[PDB]
Each structure stands twice: as structure tokens, then as C-alpha cells.
Symmetry: D2
């Protein structure tokens, strides 16, 4: 697509979906701000995509995030992608797991989104925000109760953001994928027997590719989805239909 003249911000840009989203946006002419936790991931990325603006910060830290992004400038496109999975059965969920999960998976989405939306509103420009969610915001998954809860909350966050920012020409949508074999996908489907039966339950008999997720993100960021806001696109290989 063509994002020339647009500036995008992608969180969780060091690995997986976020990294490939930065690469796709960079190839489409967008000026990209790449935010992630491990600096070495930004070092290699800047070598691969010359011209990106790296920002190393722990999005789970509100103060640090404010200091790091408070002054990054005009952002036209935002991809809230950073998240972490702390797998624990319900009866074993700890206070720390809950706190870390909501801070990174959801609180950072409120924070970065408000900073970016304020800017958009100030300049008087339309905008598009994509919240990377999961199919687990709708279906259950073993050992993912805390993570699922952060995605379920994201569903309403996306809906309410769309309602409140809509009058400002800002669209907000989510992408809800099934398992994607990045570091996170390999972690959750670690059990070979589980993965097997899990894949089998998918109508398409496969897991999603990173490319499939990146494609939906770009579609929602582009003007090709000008009347799409408030809901999401399932990249679940048909899992919800199972």
C-alpha cells in the first residue's frame, strides 16, 4: 500500500508480529517509530530498515513510557502490539502475574493511545489505531486465563475508543489471531499433543502466519477500510467456527 508521508508508531517492535509490521510499513513509505523492550532488537532492526526511530522502553512502566514517548512528535498510525504471556492455571494465578499482564497488555494501550490521539486531534488529522488482540478475547485457552482477560478487556477498550474518538475521524480496530508461531506462539503450544489436537480443531487445519496478521493490520491502517471502526478482524484460521 502507500503510507508515504505518514508516520507510524509500533509497540513491541523487537520481535514477531511487531517487527514484521515495522518492516512492512517501512517498505510502504511510512516513517516508523519502533518501540520495544530489548535494545539489541532495535539495533538489528535499524540495520535492516534504515531510517526508523528506535525507542527502548518497558511499556509496563507508566513513568518511563511517558518520558520516552511524551515528545515523539506527530503520529498518524498506531499499532498497539506489545504484550506478554504468563501461563498459569486459574488456581495458580499470582498477584505479580496479574499486575504485570495488565500493565503491559492493557494499561500501556490506554497510555500510548491517549498520547497519540491527543496529537491527532491537535493537528486536526484523521488517524487509524490497531490493537493487536487475540482469538482468546472470545474463546478459552488452557493456562491463559490472565492473558485472555487482558484481551477480553481490549475488546471493550477498542469499542469504547472507537465510540469516543470516532467524531474526531480516528478509527480504532483490533486484529484477533489464533496461534502464530513467533516466540509467543511456540511458548503456548509447547505441548506437542495439545498443538496437534489444537491445529486439528481449526477448520483450515493450520495456524496463522505472521504475514497473515501483518496484512490485516495494514488493511485496517489504510484508507481501504474507511468505514471500519470498533470491531476486529479474526485471523483465526476459522477457529471460532469450530
Amino acid at each position: 500500500l502507500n503510507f508515504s508521508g505518514l508516520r507510524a508508531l509500533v509497540t513491541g517492535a523487537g520481535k514477531g508480529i511487531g517487527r514484521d509490521t515495522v518492516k512492512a510499513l517501512h517498505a510502504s513509505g511510512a516513517k516508523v517509530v519502533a518501540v520495544t523492550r530489548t535494545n539489541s532488537d532495535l539495533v538489528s532492526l535499524a540495520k535492516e530498515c534504515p531510517g526508523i526511530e528506535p525507542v527502548c522502553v518497558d511499556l509496563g512502566d507508566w513513568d518511563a513510557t511517558e518520558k520516552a514517548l511524551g515528545g515523539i512528535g506527530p503520529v498518524d498510525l498506531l499499532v498497539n502490539n506489545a504484550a506478554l504471556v504468563i501461563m498459569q492455571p486459574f488456581l495458580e494465578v499470582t498477584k505479580e502475574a496479574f499486575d504485570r499482564s495488565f500493565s503491559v497488555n492493557l494499561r500501556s494501550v490506554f497510555q500510548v493511545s491517549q498520547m497519540v490521539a491527543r496529537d491527532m486531534i491537535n493537528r486536526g488529522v484523521p488517524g487509524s489505531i490497531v490493537n493487536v488482540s487475540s482469538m482468546v478475547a472470545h474463546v478459552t485457552f488452557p493456562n491463559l486465563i490472565t492473558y485472555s482477560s487482558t484481551k477480553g478487556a481490549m475488546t471493550m477498550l477498542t469499542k469504547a475508543m472507537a465510540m469516543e474518538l470516532g467524531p474526531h475521524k480516528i478509527r480504532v480496530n483490533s486484529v484477533n489471531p489464533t496461534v502464530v508461531l513467533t516466540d509467543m506462539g511456540k511458548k503456548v503450544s509447547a505441548d506437542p499433543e495439545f498443538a496437534r489436537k489444537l491445529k486439528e480443531r481449526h477448520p483450515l487445519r493450520k495456524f496463522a502466519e505472521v504475514e497473515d496478521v501483518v496484512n490485516s493490520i495494514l488493511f485496517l491502517l489504510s484508507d481501504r477500510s474507511a468505514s471500519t471502526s470498533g470491531g476486529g478482524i479474526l485471523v483465526d484460521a476459522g477457529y471460532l467456527a469450530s
Copy 2:
């Protein structure tokens, strides 16, 4: 997008969304079979898109449809778009309105999709089918109870088809728009006061454009949505978030 070498079939191709979907697919290199009720619409459409293959049939007739399409040949992409709206308050719904609405809006989707899926399966090719639904498959609308019910049924038809055809590499999805000012949209939003109030409820403060729907249909038909099947994309200008 590049649809060269692929053959598509679009129902309800004579006006509105269907007519523009034919134009967009034709412009993308696809051979297009245009099926519609009024023959004169096919005459004009053929001038605009030289090369389309016109088929004039009333899709509410199972026997006529079987004869008209039993031998159209290879179809790789299918857009089930034909539908009719018969506006009547619940207490005034007649057997006739019910029968016509279900024959055209839903039974034809079953029949044509069966015909096309058998062919795809026989040729051993993947396929992508798009069912044009409505946001009213999810939200109420005055005077549209029967029409809404056909769209509500479409949600499960879409999900079930995705589950059954997925192992054959066939993807099935729906597009769910809000009001789009085609002949059908203008008819449904006839009351000015109602239209004003309706528009105001939309977060984006507008109705959808035909182009917005067509963009989503092409996205779903393309290989850029390779892990999306069983659900739909809302082209509701944020209505479900209101």
C-alpha cells in the same frame, strides 16, 4: 489487486454493491460472471465492463437458478450479494414477504454456494466465498425484522460453511455494512428525521460508501486474508460501538 486468471461469480450484479464489485474485479483482471434479475442492467454493465459473462435469472427460483448456472463452468471466487428488503413492522409481516425474503436472501446463498463449492472441490483448487450480510445481523433496525432475520441466519450459514469447507481449503466470510446509499439504502433510510438520528448515532457520523464495502469484499476474496474464515468484517462506520 491481481485477480488475473481467476474466474468470479457475483450475484445481484445489476445495481449497487454488486455492480461495483463486478467493476472492481473486472478492473483487477478476473473473468467475471454477473448474475442479476433485470436483463437491462446486464446490457449497460457489459458496455462498461467489456468481457463480463451476463446471466439473467431470478435467484428466488431454485429450478430456474439450477438451469441458469448448472453449466457456467469454473468459479474461483464467489460473492453472494443479491438480496431484497421488504419493509414491514413485526405485526404486519405476511407469509409472502417472509417466503420471498428467505428464498432470495438465504436459500439462493445455499444453492449457488453448493454449486460453486462442488466445482472448486472437484478441480482441487482453493476458493474464497464472500456472503454480503448486514450490521442488522447483529443490531435491530425499524421495519426490517424479516430482512434482519435472513441476515441473522447468514451469520451461522457463514460460520457453518467455513467449518465444513475449511478442510477443502475454501474460505467463507461475510461483510456487514451499515446503511450504504444505493437503491436499498435510500429506501431503508427514507424518513429524514430517522436518517438524521441514525447518522448521528454512528461514531464516524456518516454512512458507508459503496467503495468501502467493495474494498472489504476484495480483501476477503484475496490471498491477503489467507487465515480469515468463518466471521466477518464490519463496514458499519462504528455503529456496533454506539
Copy 3:
């Protein structure tokens, strides 16, 4: 619960869920009009429940239905329960199965509900209508694409009826059960291995009992659910959370 002084109409009263619903309402002091297809069922039910008003009619027949129910009189509680299952994989669905399924499972609901609602409105009394749907209005189930479609339409039929009749103080809800071992549950889960695997996927590790469905129907019909209308109660033994 106490339904003394109220008159209810239950369709598909000759067997299963409908039969027990009649018994429960009868035991609660309600005057019951039992409508079913096979007369012999009405004859035995009348011995067991002296006082009920039997009506033998094929609900798939609009004219016979209008003739048989056009003058039953005041009805305060309506349970639309009659339905039939014609099992067929998607590529084998026939025009006949579609037509029979939609006329019995859905058109009859439109027709009987109109007659009853018109009466409640004339007399100026509040009312409660319960549409017996299924968990398959939401999840897929092998060989039930047509039946599932009729239930999906029922989801919207219920919302729209609640929306249009709400100002007349008439509530409309649905009960959505998983498999119940009536004659219908039996045929639908005739495959032993399939049944075992289906049962195992339910969080509660069981199918629903007829009593469970009847209990939710009664709850929705009662004044104990005075602010409930437009949605349904899942009697799915947790299936949707699987």
C-alpha cells in the same frame, strides 16, 4: 412459581421439552393450550394434565395454523418450541429440507407470535414470549447447517421482537440448550464416538436435562425476570466456554 390466572400456549407440546413445559405450567396453575402435530400425543397428555386445551395442527402450514389458532383467545405466556431437525452435510442440503426447516422452525414463530402479541396489545396486558433456540445459533455442529441457520435467524427474530414489542411491555427471550436426550438429541448424537467426544468437550462433562431447559423457560416467563428481554439463557453445560 405461580402462574394462576394466566393462559399459556406451548407449541410442539406432544413430546420432549414442550411436553414437560406444559406439565410444569399446568402444575403451576396456568391454563395451557397445547399445540402439536401428532394427535395421539395430545390424547395421552390430556389424561396426565386434565384441563389443557389440545390443538392438533402442522405449524409448517400457514393456513392450517391460522385456522387452528386464529380464535384461541387470550394468551399471556407463549413458548415457541416446535422444531424439526433434518440432518444433511452442506453439499447435500436440498430445497425440500430448507423449505420444511424454515417454515416449521422459524415462519411458525413469526405467525404465532404475531397473533399472540396482537392479543396482548389489544387487552393492554404485559406478556412474556420464550423462543426455544439452541446453542447452535452460536456454535457449529456437524450435519446441522440448515437447522443451525434457522436458530441463527432466531437470535435476530428475538432481538427485533424485543425491540418492537418492548414499549407494549411484552418481553421476548430465548433459551439456548446444548444436546438434551429427547428424541431430537438422540438422533443428533446417534454416533457413539461423536457423542463421547462432544460430552468431553463440555466443561460440565454432561448434556443438559429436560428439567434444566424447562426451569429457564419458566424463569423467563415469570415476573422474576422483569428486566430481561432481547437475549437468551445458555443451557449449554458450558459448551460455549470450550
Copy 4:
């Protein structure tokens, strides 16, 4: 309903829905453990329902909650009702508003539910847990973005808890009310014009009564809902159908 021989624990028992739930359970024969923030509300409640067991603790404090409830003993029925509303438009949401809201509205539900569920499992007895959610877990509401997010999270929490605890015969459901004129309801619908518009959008043209909410909670806790788990009951006076 009869809850004799059973022990229930209700959080947020000092006012509104929680207070009436304790009253209803007390009258139905259960021993009730009333958990709330303000001690004086428990003093007045014990007068009304002699025999209840008061527990004064701030549920937003994990450590204090653990000390306070770690030794309460056998619990058969749980009502996770405590919650707080901090009204703020999206662009004005603060770190503290987010943290407090998720600590009280959701983290406590994880914690208390874990303790109670471990007990039920340890004793080898079945259990029923009701999470008081809201219709805003599904629909947007002005100035309630943070609160809606906590309820959206509760939907997946409820669903995932039902999945994980189902094999232990523990049912988990939610009740999702529209505005109820308790102190919280008054706070939220303070603007008269807004409250007027809101009420008129409800198909039933009214807000829910506390009794309506309590009725559904008791139904879910009772064995009259033996195959209901994972979802919820809308006590929205038809709002979701508007």
C-alpha cells in the same frame, strides 16, 4: 428458593445490589458472609439480618484481603459483586484511575474466586459463583471506558473460569444489568438529558430494579440452573436489542 445448609459470601455487601443479595440469601436460609469496605454498613446490615458474618476489608488490597478471608471457612455460593466507577472520558484516564479500577473490579474477583474454589475442591463439593458484570461489557457508555474495560475482562474471566472449574462441578456465570438506581446508578446517569435519552432507547422504557438483578443472581446460584455456566443473563431491560 431454599439455600438451607449452605454458606454464601457476598462482596460489596454494604450497599445496593450486594446488600439486597445478602438479604435475599439470608431470607432463603443460607449463612451469609458479608464482605464490604465501610464497617458501619455491616453494623446496620447485621441488625436487619441477624446472624450474618461481617468482614470489613478493602478488596483492592491483595494482602489485606488474603488475611481477612484466608480463614473464613466453607463457602458454597459466591457473589463477586464489589466494584467502583471512576468516570473519565478516554483522553482523561489516569494511571491511578486505571489501577484502582482493575484492582477492585477484577483483581479481587480472581483472588476471592481462587480462595473459594480451592475450598470447594478441597471439600469435594459442587459450587456456584456469580460475577456481577454489566451490560457495558458489551455496549459502550460515555465516561465509562475504564469501568467498561474491567467488565469486558470479566466476560473472558467468567468464560475461562467456567472452562477450568467445570470438571470440578463448579458453575460460573455473570449477570449483566443496565443502569440500576443504586448510588452507582445515580452517579452514572447524573445528567438528566442523558438519562432521558438513555431510558428512551431501552425497548422496555425503564431501568432495572435491584430486585431484578437479585432475582437473576439467585436463579444462577440455585440448582434450577444446573446446566448453565460460562455466560451470563442480561438484566438490561432490552438495551442490547436497541
